[PDB]
Write a protein that binds this ligand. Structure first.
Ligand SMILES: O=P(O)(O)OC[C@H]1O[C@@H](n2ccnc2)[C@H](O)[C@@H]1O
Ligand SMILES: O=P(O)(O)OC[C@H]1O[C@@H](n2ccnc2)[C@H](O)[C@@H]1O
Ligand SMILES: [Fe+2]
Ligand SMILES: [Fe+2]
Lengths: 471, 471
């Protein structure tokens, strides 16, 4: 369906601002919901990106002049953190500031201090910049993966188009098997939102699924390949240390992280330290040339309520903080990945320890799921946890669909997950008293009170569901 | 569908215990989930009630000998609170204690002090007793209403059967229009769970929808009619005082409570104090003869995030506490109704004030909805709030379906609402570290880890959804 079909009475708009240092004109997307009865139109965030673009051609390379100008000026490092620490407000920073209705200097400050990141690989020229950080709107990530068999470019690109239509702020391409490189190229050239990956997945594919045949060298080659395409952030499980693995022996559900499992298998096979940890500095050198942000994985994530907040989980968290501070020494942007399965009373401890041990780097959670009892409904069990941990400061929420623990999500499942997570994210924005967040609730509630039905539906997260249910 | 179809590998069971004082044998329901691989069967709560019973005959009158014996002994008041304060452990108390795996004296103590209620009108002989209170499992209420046109007894009774099959602990019959008395009779004779009502709805129908023609007398007659049938609890909006009505003038969504609106209209028409407030003592006299519990309504509930925790809402809460203490002086069981629409940061204040101002009487919330932005998904927006406020001590959660704000729920909508609320309730049980609550999560997670797929599905809230999604 088209944008207009998904969001009746809404139009795509852009706010034009000038980047003072370069003279570059930025066109920052938003949506406008047109209302009745003398109400002013309501302006809202928009991640849906350019519409009706031929996937064989790809999106406009909107960042090209920004990247070209900085290259011509010359620079030792290419990261938003490097520029921020030099006192430079970049186009990306101004774009995010405009998008967030906040001051560009505030954005620069948050990025410089490591409390926000702008995942924006210089090779992802199609990207509409966005920011992740506790001082900003809570963001949502959706995961995609290519088809088991050969699919068309239209079919692959629709996965990003659909997730972002419903509000996904980032996506990750978690493809395995064949065609990883080719389909990721299709995604990046056609994605207006940041695209992350977990590079160890493709590295494992390069060695035919034999974890014991992994090593730094094939991982390094994989990082460069993905960076060259434009991947904006890498999940890297560098905190799964050899000595932490035995801490999982008494767990109910062991190591549930896919990347964590792979590293653990390699570590145990050789009794050697995690190669991503050992080569952390070399990873930073790669990231600095492209601006790939590092999402430090939580390979020792709890996979059951029983395992929540255990010794293994927090051992890794402590190391995530060390790795964070090391990355910042080289001006590499960082966020930290978090749980997982966590009952509600254990959520505050997670945020307290992360904020302290990781120097307020942005936190990126998978839920958490607040109970294990409802497979088929884990978008709900985890929306509860995501809203809670978002309220306490978590900056990015990885979605969970109704098919979690069960199977691959179809389009209905993906939409259900994104909607549930947009609810959690906005509920968290309200809880944080984020500026102007309540204006959205107020506009819909005013429409409800005044029986402006179409306006109520048009203002909601999913207008056609509301309208259909009413009919 | 049958119990077996809804819960494959589960059997309905009963734990037999003897009430020492009377010699009465109680058969307390539970379910048993039969597992594989040498796992012991897992025993869980069961509200589904007796299966395959002809609705034209009705359920067994299991409480008859209990009520008959107490009548023969003679008593001035018939409430569980009266008996508890006399030091008597009743069959109802022992039944609830067994059902909750807690001590009968503990149950008696909680009821005597007003911190738990056992809604159990002596005329509802079909009832399998249950308890509502912060020291017990968090409970869920589902609402039903009779058909707009003439429906069969099978069709009406299926509404209760369906809601309880998925875990509803109480129901309320909120029917309006024609046939209110007749269909409520069908429900009560065929309901194993407590049945509540909002008596002002039928009182309004008796005066042909003209609120100005209400008065104490027609309300009183309605209370007696409903009590005689066996209604276990009444929502009564006695805290909507005349002087509180102007406090709503600056609200965004005014008075959203149906009962509250009716009382407000009458109060404003005559400039006279709420007649349910004025006749509170007379209401208590009725309740004492049947054991009808009072659910003190929140007619000044906030209906939008904008109105949350405002002066009007808390003025009524203060009065709810006064009414609670007055009811206890006459040994009438009480719970208090709460919000509503409340953003997450405002939830703790709601619980703090209720616990203090209402002397820890059980709290009964409608959600709360944590954001207004997602009509069509208000089971999710409110599951977040319900889980949170449940974790802080709320004892009964009134469900919200995906059709909230939009239309009448079908069977799929009702199931979705009950499931979402069972998730919230159990998540709250975990957060409170309620004894043995985590054993359920652990059993499912162990099955997951060990690839015992059927066991995983059988242990879940909705086995056939999990199984189908996996397939
Ligand atoms: O390889 P593992 O299982 O750790 O990661 C799977 C996915 O989960 C996401 N995630 C987010 C927080 N913790 C894990 C991560 O970014 C990736 O999308
Ligand atoms: O008449 P009003 O709208 O107050 O009540 C509608 C329903 O909402 C329930 N409720 C629960 C808490 N507050 C309200 C109440 O028990 C009844 O089922
Ligand atoms: Fe999981
Ligand atoms: Fe509402």
């Amino acid at each position: 369906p088209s944008f207009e079909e998904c969001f009746p009475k809404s139009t795509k708009e852009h706010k034009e601002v000038v980047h003072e240092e370069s003279g570059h004109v930025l066109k920052v997307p938003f949506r406008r919901v047109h209302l009745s009865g003398g109400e002013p139109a309501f302006d809202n965030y928009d991640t849906s990106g350019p519409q009706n673009v031929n996937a064989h051609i790809g999106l406009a390379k909107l960042r090209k002049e920004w990247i070209d100008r900085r290259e011509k000026l010359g620079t030792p490092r290419y990261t938003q953190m490097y520029y921020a620490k030099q006192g430079i407000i970049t186009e990306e920073m101004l774009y995010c500031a405009t998008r967030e209705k906040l001051d560009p200097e505030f954005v620069r400050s948050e990025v410089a201090r490591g409390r926000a990141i702008i995942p924006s690989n210089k090779k992802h020229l199609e990207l509409e910049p966005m920011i992740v950080g506790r001082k900003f709107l809570v963001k949502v990530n959706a995961n995609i993966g290519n088809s088991a068999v050969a699919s068309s470019i239209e079919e692959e690109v629709y996965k990003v188009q659909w997730a972002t239509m419903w509000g996904a702020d980032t996506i990750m391409d978690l493809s395995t098997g064949r065609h990883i490189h080719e389909t990721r190229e299709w995604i990046l050239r056609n994605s207006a939102v940041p695209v992350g990956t977990v590079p160890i997945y493709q590295a494992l594919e390069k060695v035919d699924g034999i974890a014991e045949n992994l090593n730094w060298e094939v991982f390094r080659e994989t990082l460069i390949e993905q960076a060259e395409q434009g991947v904006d952030y890498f999940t890297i499980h560098a905190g799964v240390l050899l000595r932490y693995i035995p801490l999982t022996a008494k767990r109910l559900t062991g190591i549930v992280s896919r990347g964590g499992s792979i590293h653990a298998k390699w570590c145990l096979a050789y009794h050697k330290e995690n190669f991503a940890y050992e080569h952390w500095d070399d990873i930073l050198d790669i990231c600095n040339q492209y601006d790939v942000a590092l999402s430090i994985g939580d390979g020792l994530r709890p996979g059951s309520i029983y395992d929540a907040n255990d010794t293994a989980q927090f051992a890794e968290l402590l190391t995530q903080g060390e790795l964070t501070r090391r990355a910042w020494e080289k001006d590499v942007q960082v966020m930290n990945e978090g749980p997982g399965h966590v009952p509600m009373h254990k959520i505050p401890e997670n945020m307290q320890k992360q904020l302290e041990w990781c120097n307020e780097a942005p936190f990126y959670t998978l839920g958490p799921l607040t109970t294990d009892i409802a497979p088929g409904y884990d978008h709900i069990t985890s929306a509860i946890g995501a809203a809670n941990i978002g309220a306490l400061g978590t900056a990015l929420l990885c979605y969970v669909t109704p098919k979690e623990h069960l199977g691959l999500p179809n389009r209905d499942d993906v939409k259900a997950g994104v909607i549930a997570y947009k609810i959690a994210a906005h509920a968290a924005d309200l809880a944080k008293q984020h500026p102007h967040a309540q204006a959205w609730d107020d506009a819909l509630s005013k429409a409800r009170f005044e029986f402006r039905w179409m306006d109520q539906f048009a203002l909601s997260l999913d207008p056609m569901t509301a309208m259909s249910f009413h009919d």
